[PDB]
């Protein structure tokens, strides 16, 4: 009834750190829903064009990345500011069809360091994320669980 998306849902994902919380990216704005609540716990803003794919960071539960169809990728971090995007980057002029984030790792690459985004043009770009974004911040897991539970109780 209240969670119907304006456009068809394209990507459904759940944070590796917490299985109960999963975010579905549909049309202009992706939403986050709890395991037993029909309605979405948190709706985040609105975005230019549409969001083709959004995926949770495996290393850090708090920050999830959504790639828009305008060729701009914006990273949402709930650890610092829920209200605004942590940063916005333009991968290419062509629309980004999908985004995939690496898990586990080897050699010089840690979990979440490299993100692969596929453009409509057909080029694939791997972006090395900042160490602060990929590395877990102090008490991130405790803070995110308290905020999500509090939001769930409010809903």
């Amino acid at each position: 009834d209240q969670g119907r998306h304006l456009g068809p849902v394209y990507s459904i994902n759940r944070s590796n750190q917490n299985p109960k919380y999963f975010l579905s990216v549909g049309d202009w704005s992706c939403k986050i829903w709890v395991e037993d609540l029909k309605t979405p716990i948190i709706r985040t803003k609105y975005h230019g064009s549409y969001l083709s794919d959004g995926c949770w960071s495996p290393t850090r539960s708090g920050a999830f990345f959504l790639v828009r169809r305008d060729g701009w990728m914006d990273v949402w971090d709930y650890y610092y500011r829920q209200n605004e995007i942590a940063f916005s980057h333009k991968v290419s002029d062509s629309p980004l069809t999908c985004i995939k984030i690496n898990q586990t790792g080897g050699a010089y690459h840690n979990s979440g360091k490299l993100c692969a985004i596929g453009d409509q043009d057909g080029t694939v770009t791997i972006l090395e994320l900042c160490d602060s974004l990929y590395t877990m911040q102090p008490k991130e897991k405790d803070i995110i669980n308290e905020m999500f539970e509090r939001e769930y109780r409010k809903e």
């Binding site: 940063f87 043009d121 057909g122 080029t123 694939v124 972006l127």
Partner: protein, 51 residues
């Protein structure tokens, strides 16, 4: 001997008072680093794959 020791001590005491006023070797905020320092998030394209 008696006169010299009071006099010598007096001189030693005078040296003690000047040093006692200020440490003079202390280093303000010695050792501790910058601690919190703003960091800009950054993104670096490592490579591009195209057909």
């Amino acid at each position: 001997f008696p006169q010299a020791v009071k006099d010598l001590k007096e001189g030693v005491e005078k040296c003690i008072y000047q040093n006692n006023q200020i440490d003079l070797l202390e280093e303000y905020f010695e050792g501790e680093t910058s601690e919190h320092v703003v960091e800009n998030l950054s993104s670096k394209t490592l490579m591009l794959f195209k057909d």
